[PDB]
Amino acid sequence: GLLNLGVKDIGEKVIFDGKPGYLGNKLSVSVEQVSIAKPMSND
Amino acid sequence: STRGQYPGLYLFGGHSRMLRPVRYLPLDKEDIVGPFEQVYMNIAVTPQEIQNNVHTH
Amino acid sequence: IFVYQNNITPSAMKLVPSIPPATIETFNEAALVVNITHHELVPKHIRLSSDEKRELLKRYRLKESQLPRIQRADPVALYLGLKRGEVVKIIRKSETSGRYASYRICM
Amino acid sequence: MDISKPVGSEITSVDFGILTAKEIRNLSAKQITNPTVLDNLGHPVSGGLYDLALGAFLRNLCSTCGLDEKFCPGHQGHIELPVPCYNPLFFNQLYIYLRASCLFCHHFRLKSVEVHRYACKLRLLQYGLIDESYKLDEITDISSTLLNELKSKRSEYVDMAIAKALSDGRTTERGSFTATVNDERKKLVHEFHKKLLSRGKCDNCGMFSPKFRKDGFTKIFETALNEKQITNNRVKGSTYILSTEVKNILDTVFRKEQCVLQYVFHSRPNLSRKLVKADSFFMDVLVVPPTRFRLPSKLGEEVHENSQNQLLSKVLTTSLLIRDLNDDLSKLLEDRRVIFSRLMNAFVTIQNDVNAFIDSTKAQGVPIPGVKQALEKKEGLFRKHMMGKRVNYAARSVISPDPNIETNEIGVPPVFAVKLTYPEPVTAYNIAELRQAVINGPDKWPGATQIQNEDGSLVSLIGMSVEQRKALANQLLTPSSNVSTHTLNKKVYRHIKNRDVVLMNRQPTLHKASMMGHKVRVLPNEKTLRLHYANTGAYNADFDGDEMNMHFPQNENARAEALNLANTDSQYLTPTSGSPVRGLIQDHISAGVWLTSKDSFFTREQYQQYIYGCIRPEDGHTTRSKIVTLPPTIFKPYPLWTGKQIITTVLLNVTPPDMPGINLISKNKIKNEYWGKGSLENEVLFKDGALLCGILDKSQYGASKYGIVHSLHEVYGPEVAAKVLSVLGRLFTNYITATAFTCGMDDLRLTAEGNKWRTDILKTSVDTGREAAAEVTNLDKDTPADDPELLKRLQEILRDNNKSGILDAVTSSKVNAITSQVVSKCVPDGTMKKFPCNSMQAMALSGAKGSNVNVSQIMCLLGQQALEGRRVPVMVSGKTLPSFKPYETDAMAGGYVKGRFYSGIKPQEYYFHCMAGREGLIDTAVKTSRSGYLQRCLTKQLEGVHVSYDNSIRDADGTLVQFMYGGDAIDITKESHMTQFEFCLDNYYALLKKYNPSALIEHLDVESALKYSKKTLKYRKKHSKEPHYKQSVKYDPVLAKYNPAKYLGSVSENFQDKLESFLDKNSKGVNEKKFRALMQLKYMRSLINPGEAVGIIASQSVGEPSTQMNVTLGIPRLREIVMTASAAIKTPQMTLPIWNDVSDEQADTFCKSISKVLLSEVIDKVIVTETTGARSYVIHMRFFDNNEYSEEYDVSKEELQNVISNQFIHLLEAAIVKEIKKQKRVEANNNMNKVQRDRQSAIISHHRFITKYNFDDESGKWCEFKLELAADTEKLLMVNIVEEICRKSIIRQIPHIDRCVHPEPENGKRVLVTEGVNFQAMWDQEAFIDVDGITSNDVAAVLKTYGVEAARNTIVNEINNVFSRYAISVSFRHLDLIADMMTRQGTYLAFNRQGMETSTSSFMKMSYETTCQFLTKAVLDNEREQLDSPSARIVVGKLNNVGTGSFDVLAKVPNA
Amino acid sequence: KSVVKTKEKCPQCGNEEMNYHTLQLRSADEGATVFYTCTSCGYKFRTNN
Amino acid sequence: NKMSPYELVQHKEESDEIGGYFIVNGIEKLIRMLIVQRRNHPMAIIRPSFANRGASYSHYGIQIRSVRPDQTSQTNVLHYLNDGQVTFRFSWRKNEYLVPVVMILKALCHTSDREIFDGIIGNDVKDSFLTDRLELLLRGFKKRYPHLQNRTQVLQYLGDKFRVVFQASPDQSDLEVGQEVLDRIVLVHLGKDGSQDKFRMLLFMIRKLYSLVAGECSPDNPDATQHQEVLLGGFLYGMILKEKIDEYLQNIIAQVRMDINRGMAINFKDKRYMSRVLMRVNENIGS
RNA sequence: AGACCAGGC
Ligand SMILES: Nc1nc2c(ncn2[C@@H]2O[C@H](COP(=O)(O)CP(=O)(O)OP(=O)(O)O)[C@@H](O)[C@H]2O)c(=O)[nH]1
Ligand SMILES: [Mg+2]
Ligand SMILES: [Zn+2]
Ligand SMILES: [Zn+2]
Ligand SMILES: [Zn+2]
């Protein structure tokens, strides 16, 4: 699907620590899969 | 052409195109054409107005 | 009046208002090749006397500053040599009326 | 409004002053101090924005007057701004006086004798002494003793000139402030402020002051003094500054110069003698509005506080932070700097909040709107709630058409008859019918909904039974028990009866006949308005879903104006041209062709049925109380009548007796050849009221001049012609419902011979597209369509836009001459069914509905589908469409469609016809919005100009536009039959009754105006062979000496010279002198009445026909003339009269000597040659052959050498040096003769970097010159340079003239049109051009060289032929006033905000646009206005000074 | 200076007006294929040479 | 989805009920189709508004609208300056940015300077219009940028200038944040492993822009439907869904940015901290 | 009382 190709196109985004050269820890956060469900209610 | 559009052969096969069916005269079948494609070819509106060696569709 | 060829020195344009009450007017020699009052689109301009200025401001009960205005520096006021505050009778041809006298004052 | 509640006091004037801080501490109810609007539990907190001292808020009594919500007016409060801040309305003028002033002696930086020169010229302009201010200026490093002697004599001249002019009856001690002294005062203050701002040193004490800087608003900076000229401030023995210090400077500057600034800030003499202060420009106190005017909006629970409470809270939030920043300074570097750097930031934020409260566009931080932006545009306050308002007592509904209504009535529904109501006070003559109305109740027409008691009380009848309601019917006419209300009586708000008046209205109200006053007639059934068909063309109203307004007037002053003045029967003729707008339209015109035919014969039962079906004596249409008939046309075998004889006795019953019948000889739209051979049915003939010949048509009844309804309007009156349109509207409706009228498929067929004529002409169109293509391509003839040279140049035509225009205009010229051959042949001669039976032709020829081009496209062929000038557009490939091959020369392939709407158009013909149909639907959209703002700019200037009782039209403030309306003061709606002398002679005894000459002698002077009209007629026949400059006239016309509304025989000179030209020729018991005595009475009654809103009429007569719409043309031309008054005209021209001596060969070799010749126009090609490694260039410019350009441009070989020598290279040397500056970031020998080696040596000497030069001296074909550069420079293109220089170099040019064309002689005279304006240079050509006949197009250039009255004559003709191109007739009385209003100051002023600044009415300028720019200029001038303009008497609620309110009414009471 | 410079006999039913269209398919080396299409019967065929 | 017209009546809908639309708050909304420029075609464009980019700007220019495989677009307009040089124009956020194209011709692949010449000039070396305009283009790069000789040095300059605006990370070198410029901006319908094809397509676009200023080409009409394309509305619903999860993936970093600037209790390997900080962001993308 | 959308003449 095109949304998974859009998930892949955004890619990974990082942010480092202030805790002690190296910057800290990477946190290479991303999305890798998106899926839409048919509508379900809970009654 | 003299001072016309920039020449070249442009092939398109992607999403979101505009497409209409047209009947192709050698080996009479269906052909699907686009607006960028239609501006240089000679379709006819009825088969009683076909002129020889100029009309493709 | 004073007719010159090409230009006047800007140090010499200070002398044309330098005498009261006698005024000095100034004209090009190339602006006088055609008299503009002979043109078809202009009417017969006639300046009015001090008595005829009173009889116009009395019939219409006008102030001096409520008439239509003519500038002092258009080439018809320069032709007639108008000092400020005097009325010019304008004999105007029209399409359905013909002759009718209009008026302008030069401020 | 209640007519039983008078008012004795009236507002006379207003004046704009600055509201001082001392007043608004005494004005104030309670100062509000905390930025919390309302606290918990829904109460308003005391001390906040919502407060009970500021007004009653939300079911709670006030704390100032103690009243509730409905009765508290709201009260003024304020806040205390702790620092003086900048008022944004005055900051642009505060920054002028903060600059331009010394900071050391605190004068301005001018010398004190020149500041005094403006102090006493502005004093002379406060009074009416516009001329004495220039004599004052004729009074004349320098010691300061004679300067006091200079200031003395200038001050004594003013005190003598003010004393003389106030003694000699001229100027009041309140001064005189006309419009042209507002010009001389605005010109003098703008000159004074411009000269203040440009001063280096203070000319009183000579040392510098630091210049101030304003980047944007909210802040002021001063800059540090330079490092050089600090020496001047040592021989006299950046920084943000505070608004208290800016005020501290200008509290000293305005005191040291009090004697001057009193006249800058006053248009009129200051009789209060108040000081002008710097506190005017600052505001130390904000005024909060009353809390009534800032109540919050509410949508269920969604309640939001008002935008002003959001803006006044942020000022109060900053006004407490700035006091809490003063806590540490009250206790007292690091403890001092952080508390001061945060205090200075509070100074800027309290300024940015006092700006954003007043002006939202002066804010920063989608923004919250301020108090300026509640006033400015459409959706403002002047334009949304003052000039236009929502009204009570008014309905709107869809209209449906209706016969059987008497052409001045409207048909109202029952449910509009119930709701709309009228206050009738009970009297002795009402309690018969107004007691019956109050018994009927709110829901029984005719009834009543309320009774208003004497006390002002009001009793509703809605929730009441009939037993309770009959008791109130016996309460109406009772004597009042209150002495204080003893002269008042009860008002019963009855329903709308059949005798009331109604003002109908359809948008857009493009002219005044789109808002008329109709009578009423209620109708029983449905919920829609009912409009008669004679009104459908005045409102431009069709019946495909139109809805239109219905305003019900509420007093007797308004009922007497929409029955007598704004009446629909008074609006027969429109004042645009004098042509009728009212008449029968579609079925009635198709029925009078059948009724007035020769075939129509009626028996005795039929003939008398059609008369009573239209006359009906009991409703009051007859004038005899018995229907008279005629003897029949035929007596044997049985009696038959004729449809001529129908309308003879229809007109015999609606006419007044003892007044002879109508006499008319007119024609109609149907020719004689449609009725056969020997027919006379084209001319109509009325003789003593009897139709004797001719069909009746659109030209007779219908909106058309000089028909029978237009002639019944003149001889008998407007009440007769409005009654004839009713009776004929019922005579033809009753004729149609017994003898009908259809168009079918039968009506559209040609014959088998006519279809053969059609196809044989269209076979000649198969070669038309090729002959037109072969002509434009400059092949000769008979070349085939597949010729490769034909296809090559057609591809060259397509790539250019102008070459494709002369191909689309030659083919369209040829194929429209094939269209004109089928319409000439196949209709009517080839049609199967013919006239009168051919109903498609019968209603196109009669003007009922349709055209001859409409039946062409139906029955013959549809034609060339023309786009915006051109033919159908072509693709990039040379194909017009995918069906057609590229570049084929077929007429069908380019938009000429041969198929007709009867038999169909082909799919490629269908697609071309859809391109032209979409073109019409966009021009119907985009070109009805451009003429809407033409009329708004026109009506705002011309709202107040009107006929005075001097018959001398003038503006509302008193300034005079013209001395007589049109030069003759006759009304356009009364001058139609004024020069129709053959009509008025045939109807002499019937026109003598309506003017009644014997009863109208006592109030006249018949004797005196006739004598002076013979002294001038004899003088002008004797003189006036000479031209106009020789005529010392010695005698004015009788209009300029005698009042034409009182003196009989005081007529215009065209009326006298056309009556004495008519009555001389033909000699026809009326003699010669009784006809000239009745036309002069017809002239005098056809004078224009004083009070006519002429400039509205003159601006509606231009804006409404503008919706009907090689030089600029149309509504873009009217914007250039009227709206912008552009001196930068788009395409100026100049018409040059060729003499009779010079022939056509001496005139077109003459226009080759004026039209410019570029150097680009003579060059074939330019071949540069660059060899580098000193950068060299070989500029070789190749020309055409000398026999080719010396014939085409009359350029000699030697003159082309001088352009390269003295003009081309001096522009080329500049362009090379300009680019090197901006980048720092076969032929002959060389030993030719001694002169060419020195011709070369002079080119090298006087130029910068030339090393060689040679022109083709023996043939004039080439010019080669070497052009070296330095080796340091990088690469220049040197062809794009040369081409741009070759297009700017001129071989020969008369300045400001680029082309001179010799067109075909239009209308006899020989014409030579140029494409640019230079009058000085065309005066040298006396031998070719009549210099005393040079007219033009540039209205601003004829004003500069020929004067004011010549530009006034130029502007009339240019606004004439923009309407004469579309065959639109708008009369020269509306064009005269727009001319004399635009040149009223001796200049060429526009109808915009830049041309209306010289005007006395402040609310007129504020209502138009830029409201708070004219607002500041009024309050700075302290401008009092007399409330004269119509835009200024609606803001304050006065009766107008135009028309009905142009006088007062006084009541003669018998006892002293 | 720019402008002064100056039948098939279809065997199925018999028809001479027969709609044809030449079209060079693969390269300029081979002959142009003439695609024939009739109207009186509608039979189609092509022609190399 | 695959219901028969019998089963669409049993589920209350309608028999021949065509879908197409969104039910939002009981109201049947639908996203309209928009006609827009064709993908992946450089069309020669004359506009009077191209002159208002500053001084020396011509009315000439070329413009491509490259779409990505997730159907998201990016225009790359080339301008022609009257000085002789050309200019690459793009837009990453709601402001525009201007780059000379020789900076991009030397950043896509390892080029010579005759191979920049040979990609525009074919066998028509004798065409002295093109050779003079290509003198000014290649010498203007050496004049204005006397450094930046090889591909790895041009690409660090292009990454140094577009680092704070493309929201780069401190880990990325200037060599590889310059490739982050080239992968999201210039001719984005080739993607990664297509820098050879991006090179040849730029040499196509400069020569077509020089063929437009020479008069050899008609400007391609953007208002004719020959050069038009349809935004379907369903793809634009997916274009906006890329952004709202592009923004969602940034709010979970803008929340731990707020945690760095304030707090200390941060452990990136803690699942307890992941669920702690992921509940502090706005996850309601469907609203 | 605004925004946007759909219309009417
Ligand atoms: N001021 C405006 N008036 C309009 C507008 N639309 C319609 N109208 C008025 O309504 C009338 C509608 O006329 P049409 O636009 O339909 C022109 P049409 O060719 O349909 O005339 P007929 O064929 O005679 O009906 C027309 O007289 C206009 O005065 C509008 O957008 N603005
Ligand atoms: Mg309508
Ligand atoms: Zn109160
Ligand atoms: Zn000083
Ligand atoms: Zn056959």
Coordinates of C-alpha atoms (C1' of nucleotides) in Angstrom, one line a residue, chain D residues 299 384 506 542 544 546, chain G residues 1-3 7-9:
Chain D
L299 CA -25.2 30.9 20.9
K384 CA -23.2 48.8 6.3
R506 CA -35.5 45.0 -7.8
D542 CA -38.2 38.5 -15.9
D544 CA -37.8 32.8 -14.0
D546 CA -37.1 36.9 -9.7
Chain G
rA1 C1' -21.1 38.2 14.4
rG2 C1' -17.1 35.8 11.2
rA3 C1' -15.0 31.7 8.3
rG7 C1' -27.1 28.0 -4.5
rG8 C1' -30.9 32.2 -6.4
rC9 C1' -31.6 36.5 -9.9

